Design an enzyme around this catalytic site. Structure first.
Site, PDB file in Angstrom:
ATOM      1  N   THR A  37       0.967  -1.279   0.104  1.00 43.61           N
ATOM      2  CA  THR A  37      -0.072   0.078   0.129  1.00 43.61           C
ATOM      3  C   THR A  37       0.788   1.301  -0.035  1.00 43.61           C
ATOM      4  O   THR A  37       1.817   1.393   0.765  1.00 43.61           O
ATOM      5  CB  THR A  37      -0.911  -0.181   1.321  1.00 43.61           C
ATOM      6  OG1 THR A  37      -1.798  -1.206   1.203  1.00 43.61           O
ATOM      7  CG2 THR A  37      -1.799   1.264   1.335  1.00 43.61           C
ATOM      8  N   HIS A 191      -6.103 -11.518   0.112  1.00 40.57           N
ATOM      9  CA  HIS A 191      -5.458 -11.054   1.376  1.00 40.57           C
ATOM     10  C   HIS A 191      -6.194 -11.780   2.616  1.00 40.57           C
ATOM     11  O   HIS A 191      -7.257 -11.194   2.877  1.00 40.57           O
ATOM     12  CB  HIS A 191      -5.381  -9.439   1.321  1.00 40.57           C
ATOM     13  CG  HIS A 191      -4.635  -8.844   2.355  1.00 40.57           C
ATOM     14  ND1 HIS A 191      -3.721  -9.675   3.226  1.00 40.57           N
ATOM     15  CD2 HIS A 191      -4.306  -7.629   2.643  1.00 40.57           C
ATOM     16  CE1 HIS A 191      -3.055  -8.854   4.042  1.00 40.57           C
ATOM     17  NE2 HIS A 191      -3.502  -7.482   3.516  1.00 40.57           N
ATOM     18  N   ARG A 348       9.914  -3.291   1.494  1.00 38.78           N
ATOM     19  CA  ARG A 348      10.367  -1.888   2.047  1.00 38.78           C
ATOM     20  C   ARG A 348      11.552  -1.787   1.135  1.00 38.78           C
ATOM     21  O   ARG A 348      11.714  -0.609   0.589  1.00 38.78           O
ATOM     22  CB  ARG A 348      10.832  -1.763   3.196  1.00 38.78           C
ATOM     23  CG  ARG A 348       9.330  -1.636   4.434  1.00 38.78           C
ATOM     24  CD  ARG A 348       9.770  -1.676   5.850  1.00 38.78           C
ATOM     25  NE  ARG A 348       9.823  -2.992   6.201  1.00 38.78           N
ATOM     26  CZ  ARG A 348      10.076  -3.492   7.285  1.00 38.78           C
ATOM     27  NH1 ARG A 348      10.196  -2.425   8.530  1.00 38.78           N
ATOM     28  NH2 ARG A 348      10.078  -4.884   7.867  1.00 38.78           N
ATOM     29  N   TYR A 375       3.570   6.203   2.749  1.00 33.79           N
ATOM     30  CA  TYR A 375       2.135   6.772   2.400  1.00 33.79           C
ATOM     31  C   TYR A 375       2.319   8.405   2.333  1.00 33.79           C
ATOM     32  O   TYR A 375       2.712   9.137   3.421  1.00 33.79           O
ATOM     33  CB  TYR A 375       1.213   6.464   3.630  1.00 33.79           C
ATOM     34  CG  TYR A 375       0.823   5.056   3.953  1.00 33.79           C
ATOM     35  CD1 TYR A 375       0.089   4.595   5.022  1.00 33.79           C
ATOM     36  CD2 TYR A 375       1.322   4.039   3.156  1.00 33.79           C
ATOM     37  CE1 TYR A 375      -0.380   3.696   5.243  1.00 33.79           C
ATOM     38  CE2 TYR A 375       0.994   2.800   3.701  1.00 33.79           C
ATOM     39  CZ  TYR A 375       0.021   2.454   4.569  1.00 33.79           C
ATOM     40  OH  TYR A 375      -0.394   1.194   4.945  1.00 33.79           O
TER      41      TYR A 375
END
Ligand SMILES: Cc1cc2nc3c(=O)[nH]c(=O)nc-3n(C[C@H](O)[C@H](O)[C@H](O)COP(=O)(O)O)c2cc1C
Ligand SMILES: Cc1cc2nc3c(=O)[nH]c(=O)nc-3n(C[C@H](O)[C@H](O)[C@H](O)COP(=O)(O)O)c2cc1C
Ligand SMILES: [Cl-]
Ligand SMILES: [Cl-]
Ligand SMILES: [Cl-]
Ligand SMILES: [Cl-]
Ligand SMILES: [Mg+2]
Ligand SMILES: [Mg+2]
Ligand SMILES: [Mg+2]
Ligand SMILES: [Mg+2]
Ligand SMILES: [Mg+2]
Ligand SMILES: [Mg+2]
Ligand code: NA
Ligand code: NA
Lengths: 399, 399
Positions: A37, A191, A348, A375
């Site tokens: 996300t 998910h 990451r 984000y």
């Protein structure tokens, strides 16, 4: 800058660089982009970012034969609750997804859409604004005090799903999977991890139901398996994977403190293998490792040492993607990929290294990530991280 | 003779030779005698052998601080069905057991009584002769065709236990455990392995019940856990262990072919850990390894490579005894005992080597066993296997 102190290792001499078939896709190496996300979708309508998302995915598709799992995508308005995460229910959304999938394919890579339903992780006030429920397995246990209070203030108290409402979500999963395939995706990932709705059903902390969807291992797994079966029927087992986080505590899941947690996940794996032996083997199972019980804690923090995911391999006999703190630990990857059906998800550090695969093969320094822009509504920290060559030109080999 | 071709390894430099506490007992090393039926008990009355059993156990207690688990002992007439295996329900039996326990203690070793209920493994004709039922979980699945036919010929068809009859067995387990302790035993092991009655309830092949004792993971585990709880209440958790064989196929259990088998055993382990965290930790869990799915097959045969017992260690946090083909594989033991709560059971080679512990410490040749006398009404192949010194005097270093 490059991560200081990191001592890279070239992994080109390991199975990380051996081809493998996942579903319909001939991967050329086993470094996978797990779902991430990023919150660049635009409001209203949860639209994949019209300016930058193609470039983001193009960059990260650059190594031929890479498997990319998209950022989570909401299957319907009711499944959502974050304004800047994308959906896969509307024509306007699919126009943008089509461009993304085409771009990934032009780079000779592959794309699997993660299908997301938030449950109690959603923001109840966003949902109320849009005339939507705030859903979970139960109505008497809450993610945290802030969420409970937000729901009450919004006149949208947490709601325990009825069987009909579970059925409606399943219909939406089916349609979202169809939409994804029609737009060009190679497959979908269900998910069922990281404390979102399906995980809220799996976990006995969040699931206090006394109907057929709670109160036992089989009952808690029922919703997840119904989604698996519905998607296998709709688009084929070769186009479906499942993500699980047995030891996760993110979003108030139990983790290893629950003595029944391994049995709960072993049951799901066994049911997957039963289906496989009966001719419908999922493309993969994707596991978050106990190495990372909460992905918003720095690498090395929130490590659970009391459990292993190795049990899954005694049960499920298909491909397994492992994710969690592997970029900084090539020595661990070197051991794990000795198993010939193991792939490694790098989250990451794929945010910060568009050319991560080359860096893994060749043992190159890694770009440090910037958590502040994980984000953010920006190209910065999204599409402006350099390749290794571009970083050298910026002088990062010195800085 | 000594086993030809075996290349011994001295294990004195490993944790196999570090002390450990099990229940009330300070063991001086981690080589355990697992339960070994030998069929020297005399009929009538299932009486431990009055001539030889003391000597057998004395010999095998010779290394100070050894944990010995007895041959399985029937908790009641109804639990039995082999005329030459002993019981622990009668005064005449306990007179002999007392002598055995005293002898083991004089050698500064320890003794745990394995409590056995046969279910469908019993001989239905012996049971019929004695006016007893032929019991199992179900009445519509059988151990094999021969057993089914024997039961019918004896007018004793396999009987699915009622809840009351399960309760009666539990009463008998409790009394058998009390008898064992009163006679001087250090503890008891609940036999829930190798396809005997409790295992028949655990396993979905043998358990087709639709009441609270079958039809789900929790229900199939109910009887085993009720016995655990009853014995913990009666004699204390520190005097109780449990034996399981997750991957066993002996006596028509499912093994790894059952995709739900790991979940079934993970559930039991989790329930054990839950009790432990609530203050009642069993003394140990004893696992038969997938290395030996049937102990009547020669070492190396019947090895299941598709599963590991390692999952248990993610769940249960107490001592674990592992058994199965370890005598001929010191290289495997060396790795397994790096875990500081792992003990190793040596079965068949403790039959043939009364001084096995010395041989393990010092890397000495092992006496070959004689399978023909595993079950035989004889001192021969029971109490006449030599120590290493006695074998040298017989010239076995040459033969
Ligand atoms: C910014 C961010 C966003 C994430 N979004 C998702 C997501 O949408 N779906 C999901 O299943 N996991 C998500 N995760 C978890 C990652 O897929 C991954 O399991 C985790 O970050 C551990 O891997 P890593 O140490 O390589 O980053 C996210 C993690 C981060 C840091
Ligand atoms: C002759 C014989 C008798 C056995 N009797 C029992 C028994 O009474 N109870 C039990 O739980 N296992 C019994 N077993 C299984 C052993 O305890 C052990 O798990 C198995 O033999 C594997 O270990 P090993 O390779 O060291 O012999 C028996 C095995 C043999 C060969
Ligand atoms: Cl938002
Ligand atoms: Cl997530
Ligand atoms: Cl007999
Ligand atoms: Cl046995
Ligand atoms: Mg309400
Ligand atoms: Mg900044
Ligand atoms: Mg930000
Ligand atoms: Mg009948
Ligand atoms: Mg002979
Ligand atoms: Mg014989
Ligand atoms: Na721009
Ligand atoms: Na004699």
């Amino acid at each position: 800058s490059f991560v200081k102190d990191f001592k890279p290792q070239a992994l080109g001499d390991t199975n990380l660089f051996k081809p493998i078939k996942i579903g319909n896709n001939e991967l050329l190496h086993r470094a996978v982009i797990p779902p991430l996300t990023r919150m660049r979708a635009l409001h209203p309508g949860n639209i994949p970012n019209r300016d930058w998302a193609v470039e983001y995915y193009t960059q990260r598709a650059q190594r031929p034969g890479t498997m990319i799992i998209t950022e989570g995508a909401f299957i319907s308005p009711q499944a959502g609750g974050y304004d800047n995460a994308p959906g896969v229910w509307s024509e306007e959304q699919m126009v943008e997804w089509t461009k993304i999938f085409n771009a990934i394919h032009e780079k000779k890579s592959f794309v699997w859409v993660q299908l997301t339903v938030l449950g109690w992780a959603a923001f109840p006030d966003n949902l109320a604004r849009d005339g939507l429920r705030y859903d979970s397995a139960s109505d008497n246990v809450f993610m945290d005090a802030e969420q409970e209070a937000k729901a009450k203030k919004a006149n949208n108290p947490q709601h325990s799903l009825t069987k009909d409402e579970i059925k409606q979500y399943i219909k939406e999963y089916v349609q979202a999977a169809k939409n994804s395939i029609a737009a060009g995706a190679d497959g979908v990932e269900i998910h069922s991890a990281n404390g979102y709705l399906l995980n809220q059903f799996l976990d006995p902390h969040s699931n206090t139901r006394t109907d057929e969807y709670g109160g036992s291992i089989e009952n808690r797994a029922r919703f997840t398996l119904e989604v698996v079966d519905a998607l296998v029927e709709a688009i084929g087992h070769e186009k479906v994977g499942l993500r699980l986080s047995p030891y996760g505590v993110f979003n108030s899941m139990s983790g290893g403190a629950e003595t029944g947690i391994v049995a709960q996940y072993a049951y799901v794996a066994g049911e997957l293998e039963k289906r496989a032996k009966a001719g419908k083997r999922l493309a993969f199972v994707h596991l978050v490792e106990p190495r990372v019980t909460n992905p918003f804690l720095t690498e090395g923090e929130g490590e659970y040492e009391g459990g292993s995911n190795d049990f899954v391999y005694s049960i499920w006999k298909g491909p397994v993607i492992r994710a969690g703190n592997f970029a900084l630990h090539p020595e661990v990857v070197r051991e794990e990929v000795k198993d010939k059906r193991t792939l490694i998800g790098y989250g990451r550090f794929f945010i910060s290294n568009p050319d991560l695969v080359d860096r893994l093969e060749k043992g190159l320094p890694l770009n440090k990530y910037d958590r502040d822009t994980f984000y953010q509504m920006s190209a910065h920290g999204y599409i402006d991280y350099p390749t290794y060559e571009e970083a050298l030109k910026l002088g990062w080999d010195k800085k």
